[PDB]
Amino acid sequence: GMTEYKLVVVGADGVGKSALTIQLIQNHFVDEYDPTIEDSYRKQVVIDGETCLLDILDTAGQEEYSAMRDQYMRTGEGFLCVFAINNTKSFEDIHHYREQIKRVKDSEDVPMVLVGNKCDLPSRTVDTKQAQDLARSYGIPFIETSAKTRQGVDDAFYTLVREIRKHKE
Ligand SMILES: Cn1cnc(Cn2ccc3ccc(CNCc4[nH]c5ccccc5c4[C@H]4NC(=O)c5ccc(O)cc54)cc32)c1
Ligand SMILES: Nc1nc2c(ncn2[C@@H]2O[C@H](COP(=O)(O)OP(=O)(O)CP(=O)(O)O)[C@@H](O)[C@H]2O)c(=O)[nH]1
Ligand SMILES: [Mg+2]
């Protein structure tokens, strides 16, 4: 059949939340840095024989708009928790985003995918093993992505849809 999925892209200011979403939807990489307040995007895609209507919320990394988090977290069904592989602080920030999502939703089980973005970059500070260990401690999938090359992009979003589907049963 046809099912809507409300996905939320969260993470530190500059990890590539907007570039990841724009790459998935519009098939192009945004080199520019345009800070986001809040935008939503749409993509109709077939995943495991189901027509999925992805309703994606691209959120603010700027702490200035942190009061918006409570309402979008209550509304969102699944979360892409994005850090950049060249930014250890953004990797540490995942904990705080995950803690707020679980609390606000009263669900330790919340559909979530850990995303290590900017994998096209050689000067990396967060290794694959560090992120795999963190994802294992959360019991969630870990996917390496590049909004530039499209590496892992479809897999990150489709995996999140599959996590929501599983949670609904
Ligand atoms: C706030 N906002 C986001 N997109 C628009 C553009 N827009 C205008 C009318 C129009 C009708 C329909 C949709 C599709 N859903 C947009 C969307 N996708 C989400 C994915 C996950 C969590 C929350 C959403 C939402 C927002 N819906 C909510 O209830 C809400 C609460 C708090 C929010 O900060 C944002 C939203 C866009 C619309 C406005
Ligand atoms: N090399 C490379 N650069 C990336 C990637 N994703 C994003 N960028 C770059 O990082 C910068 C920030 O990306 P952007 O998508 O705006 O990040 P953001 O997390 O949405 C910023 P905000 O939280 O203020 O909305 C941009 O210059 C963009 O080109 C990637 O996968 N690889
Ligand atoms: Mg943005």
Numbering used by the authors: 0 to 168
Can you list sentences taken from the study reporting this PDB entry?
The 3 human RAS genes, KRAS, NRAS, and HRAS, encode 4 different RAS proteins (KRAS-4A, KRAS-4B, NRAS, and HRAS) which belong to the protein family of small GTPases that function as binary molecular switches involved in cell signaling. In the “off” state, RAS proteins are bound to the nucleotide guanosine diphosphate (GDP), while in the “on” state they are bound to the nucleotide guanosine triphosphate (GTP). The γ-phosphate of GTP holds 2 regions, switch I and switch II, in a compact conformation that allows interaction with downstream effectors, such as CRAF, PI3Kα, and RALGDS, as well as with the allosteric site of SOS1 and SOS2. Oncogenic mutations in RAS impair GTP hydrolysis, leading to stabilization of the activated GTP-RAS form and enhanced RAS signaling.
